[model samples]
Target: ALEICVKAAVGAPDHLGDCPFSQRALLTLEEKSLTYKIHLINLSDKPQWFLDISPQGKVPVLKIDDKWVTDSDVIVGILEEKYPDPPLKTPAEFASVGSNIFGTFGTFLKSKDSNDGSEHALLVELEALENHLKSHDGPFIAGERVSAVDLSLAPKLYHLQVALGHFKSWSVPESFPHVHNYMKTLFSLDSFEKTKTEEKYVISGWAPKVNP
Candidate 1:
């Protein structure tokens, strides 16, 4: 057995902010049935102590025993290795998870308008994920099991579906029926619900972006 503590921002659904990666870390911990506690920190303030654990001023700092690890990608890998049941990825497959898709998600969120080129580029990434689900015998990206991809992208899509849809009237196209159902499948998980950042908190933080 291992003891873990995660320090993160507070406003995202089950987390501190609309941080997709932090949510991934939490969701993975949940799937593995690991015992962990969350340390809520005010990210915008970047308090002095938080910097000591994470020099980069980032969240998703995974504390295992005495030492800790930051960077969402790095932490998730450490967890997957230390606790392998309910595995998120094969060791060799870890680096191959198409991280660019997450970058496109960030770009989509930053885009001022949906018609901009950012959205067009974002759609290509979205559709590939949709196609991936369609091709796999999956209720999750890795099929029957929650892999690193689901843990990685589900929180991002939740932000897209709720935040962007509410703010921009943007949504996942009905054309991507598999993707739509894929969201439903992941959302249905008990772990997913338990780790989710609540809608009210998610919306409150995004209110500025909507009005500004």
Candidate 2:
């Protein structure tokens, strides 16, 4: 079995953290049906042992075949190569789709000035997703199947929903039915349920970053 170290839920050492990247890794593992041991690192107070392996104290540090690794993108790529049973690799042309939404959501969430264009920036990204889904295939970003693009996307979208709802009382516009439906499909996955961070922790996790 593989060993993975991920950020623990905010103030809860036993649970998963609200890191989209970490969840992306977990989703890959789950979707592949790979048996793995999880190490939850309470990032606020990282242990020396954790730091010994990851001096930067980043979460989602994975030990594969006795070697340690970091970076979710790299981790996902490696996992796909090593465990090609249920292929999760996104086609190169579609890989970067929706990747900008998370950062745009962050800017919008942290915006104190309404006219700063963050809100518009976010909507433009969301609208792009909606349009993509409209022209693309069913349910997920890459047609009917759940691919790497969807796994990475779903977690960030979860945070966007929770954070925006809590801080701004905002939801994805009712007009973007494709995106709304897409979210439903992604959120309902068994793999997602097994690895999701709680709503409360999602709020707590973003509160500091939003204010800080």
Candidate 3:
């Protein structure tokens, strides 16, 4: 039995809508059926324990079997390696391309200014994702089943939707119909529902709009 420790924030969602890394880690743990404990840290002032384990003092750090794994992406990798029952990564040949595209989309979402150009970039990326999914012929990013790519992109997409409310320029075009449908499909899942943040918390002023 692995004792997994998740460093997270109080108001943040465990999945896609708010905290991507934390959400993905939580999703992975749930998918793996692993036992775990969560440690919520104040985003404004992080605890010393978190600093000791994660030098950067970021939340979503995982302490697995007494070994520390920082960063959500790294933690997911560790889970995939240790518990391969439910495969998250796609076929080896497609993994790198999937990761690179996901990374680019992540960057666009995290940008400070959501101008027309940035909005266009985001739509273009979404269009590409939409096309990929159509070509692959299924709901999940990796096809047929949920994979790491879905875990990685879902949270970011949620944030993008939320941000669009705040940043008017940010918009998802109707042309990328499949991507929009994909988001609805993923969010409808039981696992995703379990990891969602409460509406009140999202409506309230506590949560940060974008990652720093």
Give the top-scoring candidate (TM-score): 2
Tens digit per residue, CA lDDT, model 3, 1-212: 44434434445534222456677787888777777777666655566777888887775778877887788878989999999997777765445323444444445655766563654565566666776877876778667887777777666566556645454455567777887788898788777777765444433322344464
Candidate 1, which segments miss by more than 4 Å at Cα?
1-15, 90-98, 113-115, 209-212
Alpha carbon deviation, residue 13, candidate 3 (Å): 12
Residue 91, model 1, lDDT: 39
- Model 3 residue runs over 4 Å out of place are 1-17, 96-116, 169-171, 199-212
Sorted by lDDT (best first), the order is: 2, 1, 3
Ranking by TM-score: 2, 1, 3
> TM-score per candidate, in order?
0.83, 0.98, 0.79
Q: With candidate 3 superimposed using the best TM-score fit, by how many Å does residue 84's alpha carbon deviate from the native?
A: 1.4
List lDDT for all candidates, in order: 0.72, 0.91, 0.65
Candidate 2 to truth, TM:
0.98
Q: Candidate 1 — worst ten consecutive residues by lDDT sum?
A: 1-10
Candidate 3's TM-score reads 0.79
